Amino acid sequence: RTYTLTDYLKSTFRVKFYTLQWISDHEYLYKQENNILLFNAEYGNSSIFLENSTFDELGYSTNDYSVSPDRQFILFEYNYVKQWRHSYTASYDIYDLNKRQLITEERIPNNTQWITWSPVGHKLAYVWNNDIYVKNEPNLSSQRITWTGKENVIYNGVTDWVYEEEVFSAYSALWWSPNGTFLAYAQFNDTEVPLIEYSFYSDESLQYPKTVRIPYPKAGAENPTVKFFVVDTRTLSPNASVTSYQIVPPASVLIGDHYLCGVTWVTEERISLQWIRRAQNYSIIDICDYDESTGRWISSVARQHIEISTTGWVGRFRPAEPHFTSDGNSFYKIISNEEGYKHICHFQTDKSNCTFITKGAWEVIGIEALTSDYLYYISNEHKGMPGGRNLYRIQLNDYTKVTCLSCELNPERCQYYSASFSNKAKYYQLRCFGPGLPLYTLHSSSSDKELRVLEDNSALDKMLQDVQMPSKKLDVINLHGTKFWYQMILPPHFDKSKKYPLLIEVYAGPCSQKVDTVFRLSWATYLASTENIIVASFDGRGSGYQGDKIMHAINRRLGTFEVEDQIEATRQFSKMGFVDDKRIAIWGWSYGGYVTSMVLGAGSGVFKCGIAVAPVSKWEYYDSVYTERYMGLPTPEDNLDYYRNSTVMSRAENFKQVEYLLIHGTADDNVHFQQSAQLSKALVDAGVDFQTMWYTDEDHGIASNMAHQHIYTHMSHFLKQCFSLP
Amino acid sequence: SRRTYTLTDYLKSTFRVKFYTLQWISDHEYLYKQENNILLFNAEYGNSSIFLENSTFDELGYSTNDYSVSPDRQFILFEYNYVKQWRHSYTASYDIYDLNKRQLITEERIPNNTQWITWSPVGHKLAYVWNNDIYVKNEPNLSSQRITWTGKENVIYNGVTDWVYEEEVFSAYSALWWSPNGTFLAYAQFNDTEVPLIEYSFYSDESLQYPKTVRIPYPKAGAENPTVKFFVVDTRTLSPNASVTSYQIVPPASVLIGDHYLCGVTWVTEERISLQWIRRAQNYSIIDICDYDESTGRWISSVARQHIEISTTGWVGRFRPAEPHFTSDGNSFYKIISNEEGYKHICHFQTDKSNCTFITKGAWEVIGIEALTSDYLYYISNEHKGMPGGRNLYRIQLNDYTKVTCLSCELNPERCQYYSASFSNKAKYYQLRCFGPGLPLYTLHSSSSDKELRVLEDNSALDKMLQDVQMPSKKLDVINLHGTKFWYQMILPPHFDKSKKYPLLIEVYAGPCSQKVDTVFRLSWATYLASTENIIVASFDGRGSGYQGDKIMHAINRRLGTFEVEDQIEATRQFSKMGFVDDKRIAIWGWSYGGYVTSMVLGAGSGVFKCGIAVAPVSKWEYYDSVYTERYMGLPTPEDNLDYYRNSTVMSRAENFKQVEYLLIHGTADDNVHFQQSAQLSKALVDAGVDFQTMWYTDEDHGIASNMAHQHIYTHMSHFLKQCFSL
Amino acid sequence: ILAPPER
Amino acid sequence: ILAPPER
Numbered sequence A: 001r002t003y004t005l006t007d008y009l010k011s012t013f014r015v016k017f018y019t020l021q022w023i024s025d026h027e028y029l030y031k032q033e034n035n036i037l038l039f040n041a042e043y044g045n046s047s048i049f050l051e052n053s054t055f056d057e058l059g060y061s062t063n064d065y066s067v068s069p070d071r072q073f074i075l076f077e078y079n080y081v082k083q084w085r086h087s088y089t090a091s092y093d094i095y096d097l098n099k100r101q102l103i104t105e106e107r108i109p110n111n112t113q114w115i116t117w118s119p120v121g122h123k124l125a126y127v128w129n130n131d132i133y134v135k136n137e138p139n140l141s142s143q144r145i146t147w148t149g150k151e152n153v154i155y156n157g158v159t160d161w162v163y164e165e166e167v168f169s170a171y172s173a174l175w176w177s178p179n180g181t182f183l184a185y186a187q188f189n190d191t192e193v194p195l196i197e198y199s200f201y202s203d204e205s206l207q208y209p210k211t212v213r214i215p216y217p218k219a220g221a222e223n224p225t226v227k228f229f230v231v232d233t234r235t236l237s238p239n240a241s242v243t244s245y246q247i248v249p250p251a252s253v254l255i256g257d258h259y260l261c262g263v264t265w266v267t268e269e270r271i272s273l274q275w276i277r278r279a280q281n282y283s284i285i286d287i288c289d290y291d292e293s294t295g296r297w298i299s300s301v302a303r304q305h306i307e308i309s310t311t312g313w314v315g316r317f318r319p320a321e322p323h324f325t326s327d328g329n330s331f332y333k334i335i336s337n338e339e340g341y342k343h344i345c346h347f348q349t350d351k352s353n354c355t356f357i358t359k360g361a362w363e364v365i366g367i368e369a370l371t372s373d374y375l376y377y378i379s380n381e382h383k384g385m386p387g388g389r390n391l392y393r394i395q396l397n398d399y400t401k402v403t404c405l406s407c408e409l410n411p412e413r414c415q416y417y418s419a420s421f422s423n424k425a426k427y428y429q430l431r432c433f434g435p436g437l438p439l440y441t442l443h444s445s446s447s448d449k450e451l452r453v454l455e456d457n458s459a460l461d462k463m464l465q466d467v468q469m470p471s472k473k474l475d476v477i478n479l480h481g482t483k484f485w486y487q488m489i490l491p492p493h494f495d496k497s498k499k500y501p502l503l504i505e506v507y508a509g510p511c512s513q514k515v516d517t518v519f520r521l522s523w524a525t526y527l528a529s530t531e532n533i534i535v536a537s538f539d540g541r542g543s544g545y546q547g548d549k550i551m552h553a554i555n556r557r558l559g560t561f562e563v564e565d566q567i568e569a570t571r572q573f574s575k576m577g578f579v580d581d582k583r584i585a586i587w588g589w590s591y592g593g594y595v596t597s598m599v600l601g602a603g604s605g606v607f608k609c610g611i612a613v614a615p616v617s618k619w620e621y622y623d624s625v626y627t628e629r630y631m632g633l634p635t636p637e638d639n640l641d642y643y644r645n646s647t648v649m650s651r652a653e654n655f656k657q658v659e660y661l662l663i664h665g666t667a668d669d670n671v672h673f674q675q676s677a678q679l680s681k682a683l684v685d686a687g688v689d690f691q692t693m694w695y696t697d698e699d700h701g702i703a704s705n706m707a708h709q710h711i712y713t714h715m716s717h718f719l720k721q722c723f724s725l726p
Numbered sequence B: 001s002r003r004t005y006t007l008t009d010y011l012k013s014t015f016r017v018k019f020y021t022l023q024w025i026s027d028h029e030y031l032y033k034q035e036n037n038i039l040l041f042n043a044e045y046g047n048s049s050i051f052l053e054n055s056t057f058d059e060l061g062y063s064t065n066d067y068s069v070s071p072d073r074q075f076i077l078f079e080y081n082y083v084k085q086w087r088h089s090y091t092a093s094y095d096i097y098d099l100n101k102r103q104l105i106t107e108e109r110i111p112n113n114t115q116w117i118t119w120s121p122v123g124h125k126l127a128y129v130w131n132n133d134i135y136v137k138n139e140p141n142l143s144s145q146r147i148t149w150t151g152k153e154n155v156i157y158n159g160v161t162d163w164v165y166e167e168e169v170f171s172a173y174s175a176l177w178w179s180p181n182g183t184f185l186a187y188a189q190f191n192d193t194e195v196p197l198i199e200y201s202f203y204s205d206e207s208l209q210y211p212k213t214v215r216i217p218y219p220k221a222g223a224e225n226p227t228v229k230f231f232v233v234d235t236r237t238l239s240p241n242a243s244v245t246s247y248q249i250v251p252p253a254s255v256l257i258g259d260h261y262l263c264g265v266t267w268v269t270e271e272r273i274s275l276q277w278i279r280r281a282q283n284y285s286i287i288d289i290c291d292y293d294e295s296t297g298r299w300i301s302s303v304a305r306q307h308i309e310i311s312t313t314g315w316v317g318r319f320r321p322a323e324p325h326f327t328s329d330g331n332s333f334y335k336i337i338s339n340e341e342g343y344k345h346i347c348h349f350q351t352d353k354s355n356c357t358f359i360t361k362g363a364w365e366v367i368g369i370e371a372l373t374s375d376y377l378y379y380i381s382n383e384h385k386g387m388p389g390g391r392n393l394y395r396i397q398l399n400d401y402t403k404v405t406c407l408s409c410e411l412n413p414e415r416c417q418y419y420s421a422s423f424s425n426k427a428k429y430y431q432l433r434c435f436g437p438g439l440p441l442y443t444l445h446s447s448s449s450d451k452e453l454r455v456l457e458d459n460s461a462l463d464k465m466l467q468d469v470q471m472p473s474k475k476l477d478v479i480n481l482h483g484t485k486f487w488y489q490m491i492l493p494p495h496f497d498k499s500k501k502y503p504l505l506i507e508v509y510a511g512p513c514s515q516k517v518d519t520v521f522r523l524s525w526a527t528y529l530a531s532t533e534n535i536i537v538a539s540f541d542g543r544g545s546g547y548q549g550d551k552i553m554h555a556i557n558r559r560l561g562t563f564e565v566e567d568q569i570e571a572t573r574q575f576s577k578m579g580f581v582d583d584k585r586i587a588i589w590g591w592s593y594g595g596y597v598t599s600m601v602l603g604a605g606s607g608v609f610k611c612g613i614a615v616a617p618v619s620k621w622e623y624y625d626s627v628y629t630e631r632y633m634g635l636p637t638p639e640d641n642l643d644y645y646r647n648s649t650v651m652s653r654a655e656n657f658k659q660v661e662y663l664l665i666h667g668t669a670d671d672n673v674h675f676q677q678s679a680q681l682s683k684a685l686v687d688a689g690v691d692f693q694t695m696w697y698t699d700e701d702h703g704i705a706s707n708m709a710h711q712h713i714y715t716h717m718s719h720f721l722k723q724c725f726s727l
Numbered sequence C, D: 001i002l003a004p005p006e007r
């Protein structure tokens, strides 16, 4: 038996995982059949924290839990209502584990947008109807902080659509302080931000359709205005005013339009802010020290650090985060080499220059932990594969004493590794994502032991031996003098003597990685196993983790290089002995959707059919934070020409020579329906025949259980039809 | 004798059907657009004088796409900058042109973005509506005196109609009626304050970065309808510093008792008006004949001049109570109502007496009174040969109901079975438009000699090109069902062999008072699927169809989507017994009501069908406007007929959809059958495991009628059928 | 309610 | 741009 589409849609072959919760530096929390267990890493004993069946009288059921750091109380999140990528409202209660009851006095509002404990204690801080509150005690009331909240206008402490997606990457604009004195927050103003207006039809029980309105800033439009405040939660009584100080960005960024990137807390008297320009090729870090005499968060030109990029933009997406020591007088950051290779650079808090602790022909993916002795980071240096990820450990005293704590544990089963160092970096948990069955291993920083390995996906391995599974081949093709990376889900019992069909699964977005070493039971695993279709992937110009020269190649010309080298990559695959030159397709989603539609309109002839899901049509149709980072401004001064020289509706007459699926959900908050339905309108205006499929009130993911099944079943039918496969 | 009627021949209309449009400025002259100019044709001898020369069109906008001659023939209007609103509504700029002086009017033009305009029936007065407000221009080179001042966008409508009146009640945009001599200016006002708003997005050009959202006061089923007011302005007291004098004629207390609709206005005499109201259920209409009181300026009603029309079996009339035709004096009128046997005939009403006397009777139905004079009455019915699919012109004598003739039956009784006419102002001449079943034949005739006079359009052009091309053949016949005979038609392929099994297509409308089976000439999409694809496309008029009797038509009352859907499944079943039908290759396809039936047919567990395109279907009757859905289905309240509202939804048939194939075509900018209906169909199909296909047509109305999309919808539909017929 | 039946 | 819900 093969790996059927039903095996994928219903996920019968489960991939078990292990999720941690580090409270101290030797204790973490787990969950077992709805039971909250506390593990002591040092030994191997495990004490319970809360038993199953304790869950009752909680609306419907619990979908998250937040033990306060002091482990006195605990939060019970329920009544979950998704919004955007990370936005969600909920209803919360609090459980006093000591008193063994539930607090019923001064309850938490329904429709809470965000909450978080304090770094130490039970100082609860939540946001409700765009407005901040501080409930220092579970049985006490809420001291309101902001009173200016207004839906679609003023956002206090949470993020608006464009911040939550393309800048902060979470609903959270609340940052407490180490010891629980300062609650820093942010105020967003989408007042003059244009509003996109799509329709929503909901259940059958709605005679008239609602119309959703989102403060969405497209390319060249007006953006939200940020203000960064810091509240002294010490002077917080009912009969007293709320003390706060606005740290405005440095004048090298306040000159025009700007964004706020991140808020890092060094010491209790030292906050570290990261402000970037609208062009995202000028970033600055302002470190501001408190002053008990004035009560002001003052900054100086000594604590200001600039980071720009002439080759393109700053960082990978949002710029790189600063990693501050405990002494606070020196931090570590991933900035880009003069050769264009991002590595860890040691910065002094009052010294403008830098000193690189790592460098090479690779790229540091991200810093993970910093101890008075070592420094831990993950990188693709192992075996020189950019598609790999392994944990290292550099020494501050010797920048030549770095050791790979994960490289050669199981270098066949484990080439993709994630981490979770303890509070004081005493114990780290490694995550083997691929290319073998995922392995979840516990580790000790000192003895370098494997202690108690939790998961091995024994359930997966047993079931997968009674099934035929495809193979993954990773290799390199040479384009433009450099060596790019490609990947292929070769079908079971692959024989080069037979000519196979191709599926060019494509993303190739800015700083992308489709060529990885991860275990993924995907749609391709069905297409390769049962229907015997070679599914390939390629990471050419524009991809990341490989070199800024490669990444900042597509800069200010989207729809050109990423598209073009996808055509040459399939042509080189078609010169291989196992590719039906007449049976090759291209299927995409998001940037893979935009590229697929540009590839298909390229008149290359290499491709015959082509599915696209939520595809970008014109770039003047996307949020400015993203589109202006790469494409620039849609004005004649900046890059109007290359904006119009890249719309999919320009490459339409060539669509007459190919088949084309255009899938999209009606209620798309991101890649709006606007793009798909205007690409369609140009296609109809040309005489191009194409099929489509809308998905009712589906988001950008088309992720309702019956719509997800539908989209892969419907795409499978278009694919097998075009491939003349029974 | 080898070319076929290819699809490109339909989408490009390479075979033109010429017409001949004329408008009677008098009782014996008419106008016509001959080779770009306007000739003042004469009906008596045919000699044609030039009215307005061509190339006279310049410096008047980009174009000139309508013309309106002042009744005195002193002035004429130019309608340019056309902008389609809904079905009949549209905005446009207008100019007036001096005919004697042969100049253009410069002082006081007609405002840009006009909504409607009309001359008076006599003279050259000018009433018009601009920004929801009535104006009057008694002379063209003078300024207008604004009449109404309450007009508010999507709230108050003064002189025009909101969406629901334009659609289901009025079938036009205008809510103005000049009196005979132009003394009074009757009009209506519409207050859509509490009417909920359908909201759909509209994307406009590639240029636009943020889609418009269109908002329409659309009263869906069982929701708050608009309010109606009728006024009679006296255009004699219209001075600049004098008040707008007016009276409010109202429905009598029987209709005023609740919600209501103004469904018709008829001017009788300069001092008598005929208003026709109807309740929201629509099984009760009344007429209020109103005389102008000279002392008080009232329009006083009376119980005696009030005639009632009810329907104990459904709705009143066809889609509204039939309009009345008054004698030249006004003491009586002839109106088309239903009798005791359930057949819509002409009844003669004394204006001040209750009972009426029928003047037509039979197992046929009267289509419509076309003209009335003191001696004779002219109407149209499908009595001839007894087939409801035909139309012929009739003349009955007033004093002698016996003497009734047919002006159009045996004229060309093979080429000419579908006839429509437009008489002179005094019925001294008439144009007999012959629509089918052959090539159309527009023939002018005289009231006295009933002769050919002159043939206006014979379409000899089409004949020449169409004898070098193989063309199909309609088979109008009948099949017995429920102890009655219901009609059917099959557009058979050329060179028909009754032994080869042939694939079936079922073009469906099957609406209340519908006609798919007709003797009309129509180069259709099926005309291709038969000539070039060898597919028999049929059509059946079962329970629900009209012009066949109230007993048949009023069979779907308070049960839409039931009898018409099962009757179309039985009728296809009887076609799959004839040896020339590949029962393993039967299809169905529908637009609007068709899309509903098609989908409800595909989801009934028939087994008769295998594929099915549904273009712009209604999926749930609560999703459609109130007037239509309440005329038949009733009210969605649990004390009326909600139970049937809940089992007439296509989404309730989703499980039975995985036995067939399905193509959901719909337009994102449908103001009639909104995208909502197709979209929620998708949702339950998706939520049930039904694999189907879709295709949204961006910025297209309930017709998907823009040139490149009309081509596409039939290019994308042919492929579905072809691949379902393994063709 | 039907299209504009232009067939 | 911006991929579906992770993978």
Ligand SMILES: *[C@@H]1O[C@H](CO)[C@@H](O[C@@H]2O[C@H](CO)[C@@H](O[C@@H]3O[C@H](CO)[C@@H](O)[C@H](O[C@H]4O[C@H](CO)[C@@H](O)[C@H](O)[C@@H]4O)[C@@H]3O)[C@H](O)[C@H]2NC(C)=O)[C@H](O)[C@H]1NC(C)=O
Binding pocket: B561, B562, B566, B644, B647, B648, B649
């Ligand atoms: C919504 O709900 C109503 C209420 O149930 C429902 O109406 C019912 O529909 C069924 C199916 O059409 C009716 O049952 C049949 O009625 C027809 C005529 O209406 C008869 O022909 C059937 O009798 C036999 O006829 C043949 C014998 O010569 C047989 O070949 C055939 O198989 C039948 O056995 C049978 O009585 C039922 O009468 C109605 N009920 C009412 C009160 O009208 C309606 O169909 C539902 N609508 C939808 C869209 O589902």
Ligand SMILES: *[C@@H]1O[C@H](CO)[C@@H](O[C@@H]2O[C@H](CO)[C@@H](O)[C@H](O)[C@H]2NC(C)=O)[C@H](O)[C@H]1NC(C)=O
Binding pocket: A091, A107, A108, A109, A110
């Ligand atoms: C949050 O959830 C509900 C709101 O419906 C409230 O819980 C109870 O709701 C029922 C309705 O079924 C009411 O009868 C009670 O008044 C509510 N109980 C209590 C103890 O309040 C709940 O109160 C809401 N919490 C808020 C608004 O803070």
Ligand SMILES: *[C@@H]1O[C@H](CO)[C@@H](O[C@@H]2O[C@H](CO)[C@@H](O)[C@H](O)[C@H]2NC(C)=O)[C@H](O)[C@H]1NC(C)=O
Binding pocket: A238, A239
């Ligand atoms: C300032 O004083 C108290 C808080 O310090 C506020 O509320 C009073 O609190 C006492 C006990 O804490 C209660 O018994 C009273 O009922 C509260 N008084 C009122 C008026 O609510 C008090 O309100 C504050 N003063 C003002 C003017 O707001």
Ligand SMILES: *[C@@H]1O[C@H](CO)[C@@H](O[C@@H]2O[C@H](CO)[C@@H](O)[C@H](O)[C@H]2NC(C)=O)[C@H](O)[C@H]1NC(C)=O
Binding pocket: A279, A281, A308, A309, A310, A311, A632, A637, A638, A639
């Ligand atoms: C950082 O980005 C800005 C904005 O994209 C660059 O300035 C623009 O450069 C383009 C180049 O064609 C000009 O057309 C624009 O007029 C410039 N904008 C302004 C406001 O001057 C700037 O050069 C970039 N800096 C670096 C170091 O690359």
Ligand SMILES: *[C@@H]1O[C@H](CO)[C@@H](O[C@@H]2O[C@H](CO)[C@@H](O)[C@H](O)[C@H]2NC(C)=O)[C@H](O)[C@H]1NC(C)=O
Binding pocket: A558, A559, A560, A642, A645, A646
């Ligand atoms: C945008 O326009 C530019 C220039 O017109 C295109 O860039 C050229 O592409 C051709 C082949 O496609 C190359 O031979 C040239 O060397 C390119 N010139 C430059 C300056 O890069 C580009 O392809 C267009 N973008 C599209 C079509 O998406």
Ligand SMILES: *[C@@H]1O[C@H](CO)[C@@H](O[C@@H]2O[C@H](CO)[C@@H](O)[C@H](O)[C@H]2NC(C)=O)[C@H](O)[C@H]1NC(C)=O
Binding pocket: B150, B156, B191, B193, B194
């Ligand atoms: C239009 O209709 C509305 C109700 O259908 C009339 O009544 C007014 O409605 C608005 C909002 O619904 C209220 O604020 C007003 O107070 C209502 N009027 C009164 C007197 O209370 C409204 O008057 C109508 N307008 C016209 C011009 O006919």
Ligand SMILES: *[C@@H]1O[C@H](CO)[C@@H](O[C@@H]2O[C@H](CO)[C@@H](O)[C@H](O)[C@H]2NC(C)=O)[C@H](O)[C@H]1NC(C)=O
Binding pocket: B281, B283, B310, B311, B312, B313, B634, B635, B639, B640, B641
């Ligand atoms: C006119 O139509 C109305 C509404 O459609 C009819 O009233 C309803 O009739 C149905 C069926 O008989 C009942 O189930 C409802 O309870 C009635 N509702 C009301 C409010 O009366 C009415 O019977 C019709 N009039 C005539 C004379 O037949």
Ligand SMILES: *[C@@H]1O[C@H](CO)[C@@H](O)[C@H](O)[C@H]1NC(C)=O
Binding pocket: A148, A154, A189, A191, A192, A225
């Ligand atoms: C932003 O909010 C401030 C108050 O915080 C207000 O004065 C202003 O009008 C708002 N709008 C804009 C565009 O700044």
Ligand SMILES: *[C@@H]1O[C@H](CO)[C@@H](O)[C@H](O)[C@H]1NC(C)=O
Binding pocket: B035, B036, B037, B054, B055
């Ligand atoms: C009207 O038709 C064309 C121009 O539209 C041209 O022959 C001439 O101007 C006119 N022809 C007549 C009057 O026969």
Ligand SMILES: *[C@@H]1O[C@H](CO)[C@@H](O)[C@H](O)[C@H]1NC(C)=O
Binding pocket: B240, B241
């Ligand atoms: C009508 O009344 C207005 C009121 O201001 C006045 O100015 C005007 O002169 C009057 N009309 C005539 C013709 O006098």
